Amino acid sequence: SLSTIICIGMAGSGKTTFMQRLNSHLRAEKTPPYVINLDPAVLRVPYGANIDIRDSIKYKKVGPNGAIVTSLNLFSTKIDQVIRLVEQKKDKFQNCIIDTPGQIECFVWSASGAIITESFASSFPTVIAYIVDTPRNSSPTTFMSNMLYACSILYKTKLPMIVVFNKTDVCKADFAKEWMTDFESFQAAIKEDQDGYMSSLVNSMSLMLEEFYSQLDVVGVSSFTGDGFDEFMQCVDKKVDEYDQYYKKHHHH
Numbered sequence: 001s002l003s004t005i006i007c008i009g010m011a012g013s014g015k016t017t018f019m020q021r022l023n024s025h026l027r028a029e030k031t032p033p034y035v036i037n038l039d040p041a042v043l044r045v046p047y048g049a050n051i052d053i054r055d056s057i058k059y060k061k062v063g064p065n066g067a068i069v070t071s072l073n074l075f076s077t078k079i080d081q082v083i084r085l086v087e088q089k090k091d092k093f094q095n096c097i098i099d100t101p102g103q104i105e106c107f108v109w110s111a112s113g114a115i116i117t118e119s120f121a122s123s124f125p126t127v128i129a130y131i132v133d134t135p136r137n138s139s140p141t142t143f144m145s146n147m148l149y150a151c152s153i154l155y156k157t158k159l160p161m162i163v164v165f166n167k168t169d170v171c172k173a174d175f176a177k178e179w180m181t182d183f184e185s186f187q188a189a190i191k192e193d194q195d196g197y198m199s200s201l202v203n204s205m206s207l208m209l210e211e212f213y214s215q216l217d218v219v220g221v222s223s224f225t226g227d228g229f230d231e232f233m234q235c236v237d238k239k240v241d242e243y244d245q246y247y248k249k250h251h252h253h
Protein backbone atom coordinates (compact mmCIF):
# COMPACT_ATOMS: atom_id res chain seq x y z
CA SER A 1 0.00 0.00 0.00
CA LEU A 2 3.02 2.26 -0.65
CA SER A 3 3.19 4.84 -3.49
CA THR A 4 6.21 6.12 -5.46
CA ILE A 5 7.26 9.66 -6.39
CA ILE A 6 10.01 10.16 -8.97
CA CYS A 7 11.67 13.54 -9.08
CA ILE A 8 12.79 14.74 -12.49
CA GLY A 9 13.92 18.17 -13.68
CA MET A 10 16.67 20.06 -15.50
CA ALA A 11 19.92 20.94 -13.75
CA GLY A 12 19.28 23.66 -11.17
CA SER A 13 15.51 23.22 -10.94
CA GLY A 14 16.08 22.36 -7.28
CA LYS A 15 14.98 18.74 -7.26
CA THR A 16 17.35 17.61 -4.48
CA THR A 17 16.24 20.53 -2.25
CA PHE A 18 12.64 19.67 -3.20
CA MET A 19 13.14 16.06 -2.11
CA GLN A 20 14.76 17.11 1.17
CA ARG A 21 11.74 19.34 1.83
CA LEU A 22 9.35 16.54 0.80
CA ASN A 23 11.15 14.20 3.16
CA SER A 24 11.10 16.69 5.98
CA HIS A 25 7.46 17.52 5.24
CA LEU A 26 6.55 13.82 5.31
CA ARG A 27 8.59 13.26 8.46
CA ALA A 28 6.62 16.07 10.07
CA GLU A 29 3.45 14.11 9.34
CA LYS A 30 5.23 11.20 11.08
CA THR A 31 5.22 9.28 7.78
CA PRO A 32 8.89 9.04 6.78
CA PRO A 33 9.58 7.92 3.21
CA TYR A 34 11.78 5.23 1.74
CA VAL A 35 14.42 7.09 -0.22
CA ILE A 36 16.23 6.17 -3.42
CA ASN A 37 19.04 8.23 -5.03
CA LEU A 38 19.94 7.61 -8.68
CA ASP A 39 22.37 10.49 -9.14
CA PRO A 40 25.86 8.98 -9.07
CA ALA A 41 27.56 12.37 -9.09
CA VAL A 42 26.05 13.88 -5.93
CA LEU A 43 27.97 14.75 -2.80
CA ARG A 44 25.34 14.24 -0.12
CA VAL A 45 21.89 12.74 0.04
CA PRO A 46 19.74 14.99 2.27
CA TYR A 47 18.62 12.56 4.96
CA GLY A 48 20.05 9.32 3.69
CA ALA A 49 19.13 7.07 0.81
CA ASN A 50 17.84 3.62 1.73
CA ILE A 51 18.97 2.49 -1.67
CA ASP A 52 21.80 4.59 -3.04
CA ILE A 53 23.23 3.94 -6.48
CA ARG A 54 26.84 4.89 -5.86
CA ASP A 55 27.72 2.50 -3.00
CA SER A 56 26.26 -0.11 -5.34
CA ILE A 57 28.25 1.12 -8.37
CA LYS A 58 31.57 3.01 -8.33
CA TYR A 59 33.49 4.37 -11.35
CA LYS A 60 36.06 3.09 -12.27
CA LYS A 61 34.97 4.83 -15.47
CA VAL A 62 36.67 3.80 -18.72
CA GLY A 63 33.15 11.29 -20.66
CA PRO A 64 31.38 13.06 -17.75
CA ASN A 65 27.94 12.36 -19.26
CA GLY A 66 28.52 8.85 -20.54
CA ALA A 67 29.97 8.23 -17.06
CA ILE A 68 26.57 9.12 -15.63
CA VAL A 69 24.77 7.17 -18.38
CA THR A 70 26.59 3.89 -17.77
CA SER A 71 25.93 3.99 -14.03
CA LEU A 72 22.21 3.97 -14.73
CA ASN A 73 22.69 0.99 -17.02
CA LEU A 74 24.45 -1.07 -14.36
CA PHE A 75 21.71 -0.20 -11.90
CA SER A 76 18.81 -0.96 -14.23
CA THR A 77 19.88 -4.61 -14.41
CA LYS A 78 19.50 -5.50 -10.72
CA ILE A 79 16.15 -3.68 -10.97
CA ASP A 80 13.98 -6.70 -10.16
CA GLN A 81 15.97 -7.17 -6.96
CA VAL A 82 15.43 -3.51 -6.05
CA ILE A 83 11.70 -3.87 -6.54
CA ARG A 84 11.71 -6.99 -4.33
CA LEU A 85 13.41 -4.94 -1.63
CA VAL A 86 10.90 -2.05 -1.80
CA GLU A 87 7.98 -4.46 -2.03
CA GLN A 88 9.08 -6.13 1.21
CA LYS A 89 8.95 -2.72 2.82
CA LYS A 90 5.71 -1.64 1.10
CA ASP A 91 3.50 -1.52 4.19
CA LYS A 92 6.09 0.04 6.51
CA PHE A 93 6.52 3.25 4.50
CA GLN A 94 3.74 5.41 3.09
CA ASN A 95 5.88 6.72 0.22
CA CYS A 96 8.99 5.91 -1.73
CA ILE A 97 10.84 8.95 -3.01
CA ILE A 98 13.23 8.81 -5.96
CA ASP A 99 15.88 11.38 -6.92
CA THR A 100 17.26 11.40 -10.43
CA PRO A 101 20.42 12.90 -11.90
CA GLY A 102 20.52 16.47 -13.20
CA GLN A 103 21.57 15.37 -16.67
CA ILE A 104 17.96 14.90 -17.53
CA GLU A 105 18.26 13.33 -20.99
CA CYS A 106 20.19 10.47 -19.42
CA PHE A 107 17.04 9.34 -17.66
CA VAL A 108 14.00 10.40 -19.66
CA TRP A 109 15.01 9.28 -23.17
CA SER A 110 17.35 6.46 -22.21
CA ALA A 111 16.13 2.87 -22.16
CA SER A 112 17.65 1.84 -18.84
CA GLY A 113 15.92 4.94 -17.52
CA ALA A 114 12.58 3.83 -18.94
CA ILE A 115 13.04 0.36 -17.50
CA ILE A 116 13.55 1.59 -13.94
CA THR A 117 10.49 3.81 -14.27
CA GLU A 118 8.32 1.03 -15.74
CA SER A 119 9.55 -1.53 -13.19
CA PHE A 120 8.32 0.83 -10.49
CA ALA A 121 5.16 1.69 -12.40
CA SER A 122 4.30 -2.01 -12.70
CA SER A 123 4.61 -2.67 -8.97
CA PHE A 124 3.41 0.52 -7.23
CA PRO A 125 1.24 3.50 -8.04
CA THR A 126 3.90 5.96 -9.17
CA VAL A 127 3.70 9.69 -9.98
CA ILE A 128 6.30 11.78 -11.82
CA ALA A 129 7.22 15.02 -10.01
CA TYR A 130 8.51 17.34 -12.72
CA ILE A 131 10.46 20.07 -10.97
CA VAL A 132 10.64 23.34 -12.84
CA ASP A 133 13.09 26.19 -12.29
CA THR A 134 10.32 28.80 -11.97
CA PRO A 135 12.38 31.97 -11.58
CA ARG A 136 13.74 31.36 -15.09
CA ASN A 137 10.90 29.32 -16.60
CA SER A 138 10.28 32.01 -19.23
CA SER A 139 13.82 31.92 -20.65
CA PRO A 140 13.34 30.49 -24.16
CA THR A 141 15.77 27.53 -23.98
CA THR A 142 14.43 26.63 -20.55
CA PHE A 143 10.80 26.92 -21.63
CA MET A 144 11.44 24.87 -24.78
CA SER A 145 13.52 22.27 -22.90
CA ASN A 146 10.86 21.98 -20.21
CA MET A 147 7.95 21.70 -22.63
CA LEU A 148 9.85 19.11 -24.70
CA TYR A 149 11.12 17.02 -21.75
CA ALA A 150 7.81 17.12 -19.87
CA CYS A 151 5.71 16.09 -22.86
CA SER A 152 8.25 13.34 -23.68
CA ILE A 153 7.87 11.88 -20.19
CA LEU A 154 4.06 12.01 -20.28
CA TYR A 155 4.22 10.22 -23.63
CA LYS A 156 6.90 7.58 -23.07
CA THR A 157 6.13 6.82 -19.43
CA LYS A 158 2.36 7.10 -19.63
CA LEU A 159 2.42 7.97 -15.92
CA PRO A 160 0.54 10.66 -13.94
CA MET A 161 2.54 13.88 -13.65
CA ILE A 162 2.64 16.78 -11.23
CA VAL A 163 4.35 19.84 -12.65
CA VAL A 164 6.11 21.46 -9.73
CA PHE A 165 6.82 25.15 -10.21
CA ASN A 166 9.58 25.25 -7.60
CA LYS A 167 11.08 28.20 -5.62
CA THR A 168 7.82 30.22 -5.34
CA ASP A 169 9.41 32.10 -2.43
CA VAL A 170 11.11 34.31 -5.05
CA CYS A 171 8.40 34.20 -7.72
CA LYS A 172 5.11 35.88 -8.53
CA ALA A 173 2.52 35.06 -5.87
CA ASP A 174 -0.15 32.56 -6.96
CA PHE A 175 2.16 31.46 -9.80
CA ALA A 176 0.75 27.94 -10.24
CA LYS A 177 -2.88 29.04 -10.38
CA GLU A 178 -2.12 31.88 -12.79
CA TRP A 179 -0.19 29.45 -14.98
CA MET A 180 -3.15 27.06 -15.20
CA THR A 181 -5.52 29.98 -15.81
CA ASP A 182 -3.47 31.24 -18.75
CA PHE A 183 -3.05 27.71 -20.11
CA GLU A 184 -6.76 26.90 -19.92
CA SER A 185 -7.84 30.31 -21.26
CA PHE A 186 -5.37 29.56 -24.03
CA GLN A 187 -7.01 26.19 -24.85
CA ALA A 188 -10.34 27.98 -25.11
CA ALA A 189 -9.12 30.71 -27.43
CA ILE A 190 -7.91 27.93 -29.67
CA LYS A 191 -11.38 26.37 -29.98
CA GLU A 192 -13.21 29.39 -31.48
CA ASP A 193 -15.28 29.58 -34.70
CA GLN A 194 -12.96 32.22 -36.17
CA ASP A 195 -10.68 32.05 -39.18
CA GLY A 196 -7.31 30.55 -38.26
CA TYR A 197 -8.59 27.86 -35.90
CA MET A 198 -10.99 25.86 -38.02
CA SER A 199 -8.30 23.84 -39.79
CA SER A 200 -7.74 20.16 -39.17
CA LEU A 201 -4.23 21.06 -37.96
CA VAL A 202 -5.27 23.52 -35.30
CA ASN A 203 -7.90 20.99 -34.30
CA SER A 204 -5.17 18.31 -34.00
CA MET A 205 -3.10 20.63 -31.81
CA SER A 206 -6.05 21.44 -29.57
CA LEU A 207 -6.60 17.70 -29.04
CA MET A 208 -2.90 17.10 -28.40
CA LEU A 209 -2.90 19.93 -25.88
CA GLU A 210 -5.88 18.53 -24.03
CA GLU A 211 -4.45 14.99 -23.93
CA PHE A 212 -1.21 16.17 -22.29
CA TYR A 213 -2.81 18.67 -19.94
CA SER A 214 -5.40 16.18 -18.66
CA GLN A 215 -2.73 13.72 -17.45
CA LEU A 216 -1.01 16.31 -15.33
CA ASP A 217 -1.56 18.54 -12.32
CA VAL A 218 0.16 21.85 -11.48
CA VAL A 219 1.49 23.09 -8.17
CA GLY A 220 3.82 25.83 -7.04
CA VAL A 221 6.07 25.21 -4.06
CA SER A 222 8.97 26.66 -2.19
CA SER A 223 11.49 23.99 -1.14
CA PHE A 224 13.01 26.47 1.30
CA THR A 225 9.84 27.30 3.23
CA GLY A 226 7.72 24.17 2.71
CA ASP A 227 5.05 26.40 1.19
CA GLY A 228 2.93 24.32 -1.18
CA PHE A 229 3.89 20.86 -0.02
CA ASP A 230 0.50 20.12 1.51
CA GLU A 231 -1.04 20.83 -1.89
CA PHE A 232 1.64 18.70 -3.55
CA MET A 233 0.76 15.67 -1.44
CA GLN A 234 -2.91 16.29 -2.17
CA CYS A 235 -2.18 16.02 -5.88
CA VAL A 236 -0.10 12.92 -5.31
CA ASP A 237 -2.90 11.34 -3.29
CA LYS A 238 -5.36 12.45 -6.04
CA LYS A 239 -3.33 10.75 -8.75
CA VAL A 240 -2.91 7.69 -6.53
CA ASP A 241 -6.46 6.30 -6.16
CA GLU A 242 -7.05 7.26 -9.79
CA TYR A 243 -4.11 4.99 -10.66
CA ASP A 244 -6.19 1.81 -10.48
CA GLN A 245 -8.67 3.13 -13.01
CA TYR A 246 -6.57 4.97 -15.56
CA TYR A 247 -2.91 4.00 -15.51
CA LYS A 248 -2.68 0.37 -14.35
CA LYS A 249 -3.79 -0.70 -17.83
CA HIS A 250 -0.42 0.41 -19.22
CA HIS A 251 1.84 -1.31 -16.64
CA HIS A 252 2.09 -5.09 -16.08
CA HIS A 253 4.80 -7.71 -15.42
Ligand SMILES: Nc1nc2c(ncn2[C@@H]2O[C@H](COP(=O)(O)OP(=O)(O)CP(=O)(O)O)[C@@H](O)[C@H]2O)c(=O)[nH]1
Pocket residue numbers: 009010011012013014015016017018039101102103166167168169170221222223224225
Ligand atom coordinates in the same frame (compact mmCIF):
# COMPACT_ATOMS: atom_id res chain seq x y z
N1 LIG B 1 14.85 30.50 -3.58
C1 LIG B 1 14.84 29.15 -3.66
N2 LIG B 1 15.96 28.53 -4.11
C2 LIG B 1 16.01 27.18 -4.22
C3 LIG B 1 14.82 26.40 -3.84
N3 LIG B 1 15.13 25.11 -4.04
C4 LIG B 1 16.40 25.07 -4.52
N4 LIG B 1 16.94 26.30 -4.62
C5 LIG B 1 18.31 26.63 -5.10
O1 LIG B 1 18.52 26.15 -6.44
C6 LIG B 1 19.89 25.78 -6.64
C7 LIG B 1 19.95 24.33 -7.11
O2 LIG B 1 19.50 23.53 -6.01
P1 LIG B 1 19.58 21.94 -6.08
O3 LIG B 1 18.47 21.36 -5.22
O4 LIG B 1 21.02 21.51 -5.88
O5 LIG B 1 19.19 21.80 -7.63
P2 LIG B 1 19.40 20.45 -8.45
O6 LIG B 1 18.53 20.47 -9.65
O7 LIG B 1 19.04 19.17 -7.55
C8 LIG B 1 21.14 20.49 -8.94
P3 LIG B 1 21.49 19.00 -9.89
O8 LIG B 1 20.49 18.93 -11.15
O9 LIG B 1 23.01 19.08 -10.40
O10 LIG B 1 21.27 17.82 -9.03
C9 LIG B 1 20.56 25.89 -5.28
O11 LIG B 1 21.33 27.09 -5.26
C10 LIG B 1 19.42 25.99 -4.29
O12 LIG B 1 19.82 26.76 -3.16
C11 LIG B 1 13.64 27.15 -3.35
O13 LIG B 1 12.59 26.54 -3.01
N5 LIG B 1 13.73 28.49 -3.28
Ligand SMILES: CCCCCCCCCCCC(=O)O
Pocket residue numbers: 132137138142143146147150151163208209212213216
Ligand atom coordinates in the same frame (compact mmCIF):
# COMPACT_ATOMS: atom_id res chain seq x y z
C1 LIG C 1 1.91 20.62 -24.79
C2 LIG C 1 1.07 21.37 -23.79
C3 LIG C 1 0.99 20.66 -22.43
C4 LIG C 1 2.32 20.62 -21.68
C5 LIG C 1 2.18 21.21 -20.28
C6 LIG C 1 3.26 20.73 -19.31
C7 LIG C 1 4.64 21.26 -19.65
C8 LIG C 1 5.24 22.05 -18.50
C9 LIG C 1 6.46 22.85 -18.96
C10 LIG C 1 6.78 24.00 -18.01
C11 LIG C 1 6.78 25.29 -18.81
C12 LIG C 1 7.20 26.48 -17.97
O1 LIG C 1 8.42 26.57 -17.67
O2 LIG C 1 6.41 27.45 -17.92
Ligand SMILES: [Mg+2]
Pocket residue numbers: 014015016017039102
Ligand atom coordinates in the same frame (compact mmCIF):
# COMPACT_ATOMS: atom_id res chain seq x y z
MG1 LIG D 1 20.07 17.40 -7.37
